[model samples]
Target: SWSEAFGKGAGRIQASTIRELLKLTQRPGILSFAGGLPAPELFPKEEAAEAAARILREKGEVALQYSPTEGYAPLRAFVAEWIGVRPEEVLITTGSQQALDLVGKVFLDEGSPVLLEAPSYMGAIQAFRLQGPRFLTVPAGEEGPDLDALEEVLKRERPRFLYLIPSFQNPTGGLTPLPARKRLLQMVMERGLVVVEDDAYRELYFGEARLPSLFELAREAGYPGVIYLGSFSKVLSPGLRVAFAVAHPEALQKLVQAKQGADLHTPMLNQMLVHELLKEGFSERLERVRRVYREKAQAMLHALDREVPKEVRYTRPKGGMFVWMELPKGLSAEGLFRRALEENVAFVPGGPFFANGGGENTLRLSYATLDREGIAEGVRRLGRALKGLLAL
Candidate 1:
């Protein structure tokens, strides 16, 4: 019946442009500069495997059995402690993707008002769109979303929620400056608005010092309007499907109810294993991932500056998975993406990331999954692709 109403939602959900384009460039010798996945080598497979073994040996039946809707207790407590939120305030989901889905189901009715970044997280846009939210895009610059524009939109639309990847934002690896973040938070409070802050890449920092998270700022001010969503997928393996959300108690309650109808709970085995690994030393592995990604990001930035055409411009991300590029006039990102596939270099056109779909000259390049040498080579191949396109 649901399928009849939705009409092949799975088929309708557009394929990820990055994954689809990368598929074309997955030749043995080809270098893929797309997909914001963490370095495979750094994934704590051995550590996680050991944790899983421990869980099996100790509580095999319970690990496999259906459990609490709120997630594994120890894992919940552990996440709450780490994130500066109360246990009741945290809701663990099957990856942050599910968290997004649950939020849409719970908060958005058909045609509910929402505010989002212009070039926002593709997955969130898709999730919210499915629920028929009337999404409004706020302008995003090299810094975070233009706060002045956001305030104006807040006043005009009075959106129910605003979604942002404030830290190491996807596609455009720009960090929202602390001043801008503070100003935005203050304005949101003044307007009595709630924000969904997606901080999936918070831990991936380059040289820049960390700024306070929207959640932290809210708590410090004795306010509870911002809902922060985070994932272990980038820092850990996505197979575990581990993520947590922090929000006001009432908001979290709604998610719990929605989650109950969705799948009852995230997998207990994965949660217990993650809890085990947290004690075994998650920080050391995360540090390794950070170092590898930082180096790769550096290589990507340096290559973009040295190899890209002078007329072309790009973002210099301090630390994170992606670099956003804007090609010179007369160039289309779609054309470049196709040409790069032929040249064994693949990336995502930025148009799909936008809510209004007008980024024809923009593209996103990812550095996390590739090594420094691969980054340099990928950029070189991209340079060739662009030169050929220019000539033609």
Candidate 2:
């Protein structure tokens, strides 16, 4: 009966592996490193409360009513200014996830060709997959994608777009360097390829200075095919659901049209709340969160060094919330994940992050949601899990 009401595309889409594993995190005694969540203790609760009260007290009517699909004018202007783009070049969506979905709606069709980093964001992979694209993988290392490999794919396949998370990328937490970014842009220009740059984690860098974004580079080169996606979810609060995309005017219009059919617009109250919070000192709150995450990330790295076996290899991220781990040969993350749960620990397997399927020997650990003690204990449990699997 349920099958009768569903469309062809609906059947093609399935729930994300991460989403399905969320319930496991709720189990008693389970210490989860699976979800890429911000630390709850670090939220600016007092500031958020004050901002919400003021907005409701002064502008309750306006905040409660339906607003333009393009987004609140003041918020749009602020986002435009923040990203060094004009207001018309920006379109607000519920979250960066929606931006990805809308882009998929506009750009992809059944069996359309799309390129992505081999182990990309599972959420992005899922969002784009709903359109039924023929997924192609581009191998990426510490600096960036393998340029020769990327160019080869471009010349052979000619995908509609290449989706990437250049700044502190998800799953891998590898920041693409300036030289590689420049080289990638040169290739894009030469090959006439479009790019969708997801930048949700860019603002969370632990370093003193942030790197220039791929979007910024593309803009400096006067290339209009790069669609830049940003979100306050990582910096301020995910619940507010405020995010934006900066694109060429025509592409932006198409995204706006797609968004109009999705939810009419992101909630006015949430947008106003974010705008008000930003006005009241969002930068200070962001700095506090960064410090907290920095400490947590260090704790995770230290724990892994003290507990995990020498055979296991993992990335030492400079910034961002994740540390990707590679199990020794012959050890599968799927088996380790199950054993870790029995040991009261959990992490996301790397297989789901791969576009065409091959990271079976890897897993991803997130440090954003836990404290130092929690991180240390989780790593110890994970170590025990690995030892148990080795004995098997």
Candidate 3:
């Protein structure tokens, strides 16, 4: 009620459970799968130093100087060329999390309708929660969201936009097929609703051929309803805090306006650094990331396969940092979490990922920050806990 007195938005905010759990997992000797972090060993430390030196030498003052709210010109150009979008449609944000916040501010009113997959990205859920909007969910599965269920939801409520992670989705690691994307686009377009495509893990794909993004499909049809978000956090260094949003001019303008009020702009230095880094070795870096994540993902799944009970269910992600697990009926993820902690393995319980609540039997595991050895040992410990719980 205190923040309520300050502002309704303030009142609506809740501390993220993930962040809180991350603190507990930080102690030495714990094998943690709770974070969404990239492998620290792979970060381009030498390349970053070289880029910073060049920027300070060639464009010293400008590198540190404040620039346009739309972000650095060259950075926008780099993103535009990469995503095949025009510069006019790109808006740089401090992070993809900021982009979600901007989307909430731009579209959400108090009690406004927001749509999402039942088990969606937690960051977006936390970001949207600040606005206190009504969360409407569509049931999500291994393939994607249930289109039949979505049809029912749309029939009843006209949500502001459908928030989704189409490729390598968070928690679930589900990929929506191109055909489904097309049908979904058609369904929403017919209803005059837009889509928010948070493409955080597309570059981390384990497959040779990647499915086309909603952004691409939307552009092919000349539709301006998809606001596509891209981030460097997964492939490149996240500490730089550079991410972007691709949208129609109307939304882009509002996003930029909101960004200006928030921080005036993302740091000029960070934008230039990303542009400098992108000009060299980006594709190679992407290959390294894809290969690393693919191997790590496989390691986790194989360990789980060898160790866990047959009744245990989990995703075989084609590519992404995480695997979603569903314990047998009546099993509690929280109870398993406690047992795992006793064995020095840590993972995220999936209850917080559900916008409408009640996923006490589910959990998320990330393999990105762990190695084959660490993953093997961790899952072994986790299996012991899981087995102990199953017996109970």
Best by TM-score: 3
In model 3, the clashing pairs are none
lDDT of 3 by residue, 1-392 (tens): 76456877666666668557678777779998887888887788998899989988899898787788998888888899999988888999998999999999999988989999989998899889888899999888878899999999999999999999989899899988889999998898788788999998879889997789988988898788999999988878888889999999988999999999999999888888888888987889889888898888888999999888888999999888899999987899988988888889989999999998998899999888889999999999988888889888
- Estimate TM-scores for all models: 0.94, 0.96, 0.97
Alpha-carbon local distance difference test for all models: 0.82, 0.87, 0.89
Angstrom error at residue 296, model 3: 1.0
Clashing pairs in 2: none
lDDT of 1 by residue, 88-194 (tens): 88899999998899888877887789898888788898878777777789877688898888777777788878888888888788889878888888988887888
Instruction: Report the lDDT tens digits of candidate 2 across residue range 23-119.
Output: 8867888888898987788667998898889888899998898888999888998888788888999899999999999989998999999999989
Q: Ten-residue segment with the worst summed lDDT in candidate 3?
A: 10-19
**Residue runs of model 2 more than 4 Å from their true location after superposition:** none
Off by over 4 Å in 3: 1-5
Residue 300 accuracy (lDDT) in model 1: 81
The prediction achieving the highest lDDT against the true structure is: 3
Better of 1 and 2 by TM-score: 2
Query: How much is the lDDT of residue 255 in candidate 2?
Result: 93
**What is the Cα-based lDDT of residue 80 in candidate 2?**
83
Between prediction 1 and prediction 2, the one with superior lDDT is 2
